[PDB]
Ligand binder design. Sequence first.
Ligand SMILES: *CCC(=O)N1CC2(CCN(c3nc(N[C@H](CC(=O)NC)CC(C)C)nc(-c4cccc(N5CCOCC5)c4)n3)C2)C1
Ligand SMILES: Nc1nc2c(ncn2[C@@H]2O[C@H](COP(=O)(O)OP(=O)(O)O)[C@@H](O)[C@H]2O)c(=O)[nH]1
Ligand SMILES: [Ca+2]
Length: 170
Amino acid sequence: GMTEYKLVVVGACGVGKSALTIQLIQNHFVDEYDPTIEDSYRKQVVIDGETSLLDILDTAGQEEYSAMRDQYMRTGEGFLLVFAINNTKSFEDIHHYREQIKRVKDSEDVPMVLVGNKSDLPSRTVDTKQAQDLARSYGIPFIETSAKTRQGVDDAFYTLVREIRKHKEK
Ligand SMILES: *CCC(=O)N1CC2(CCN(c3nc(N[C@H](CC(=O)NC)CC(C)C)nc(-c4cccc(N5CCOCC5)c4)n3)C2)C1
Ligand SMILES: Nc1nc2c(ncn2[C@@H]2O[C@H](COP(=O)(O)OP(=O)(O)O)[C@@H](O)[C@H]2O)c(=O)[nH]1
Ligand SMILES: [Ca+2]
């Protein structure tokens, strides 16, 4: 059989949301992607031996509110909380994303994965300890990734699917 999962990729401008998504769906790195393009993307993969259809919303745009975001916040089953390891404010922003997702779900138990992207870059400003401890406090996995090299990209998305599977079992 197969299973479909509705995923949402959130995080500050420029953390690599589109780059991660495109690495997953097209298997290569894109340097330039219009920051105003918010859209969902479908992709069939195989995760732990089961065919998995991913429906991924790559959040974007300058708008405070988006009908598409609203829809996926309601129906999305899992959320990728992305920050760039060289941008401290993007890490500080993670709290605000998690808080909003929890409120719309009216639940403290929403499948999420914390993603520290741009792990290839030398000049990091967010310590791995901070991120590990944050994820620890949230009770969620932390995966380090690089959309550029593709390091950890499948792990981030597949880990999120595994978290969804656990949540559906409850
Ligand atoms: C460069 C473009 C890009 O990739 N961007 C800009 C954004 C778009 C989504 N962003 C965002 N979104 C929210 N809230 C969303 C609300 C919504 O659309 N509901 C239907 C829901 C999220 C996506 C789960 N919030 C923020 C945000 C970030 C940091 C601080 C705040 N403040 C905190 C203080 O109180 C006011 C909100 C909000 N950003 C950015 C991704
Ligand atoms: N070095 C490096 N650059 C990245 C990585 N991921 C994204 N970028 C770059 O960061 C910028 C923003 O990426 P983008 O996918 O547009 O971020 P978004 O605004 O969160 O969708 C682009 O110039 C990308 O090429 C990464 O893992 N490593
Ligand atoms: Ca984007």
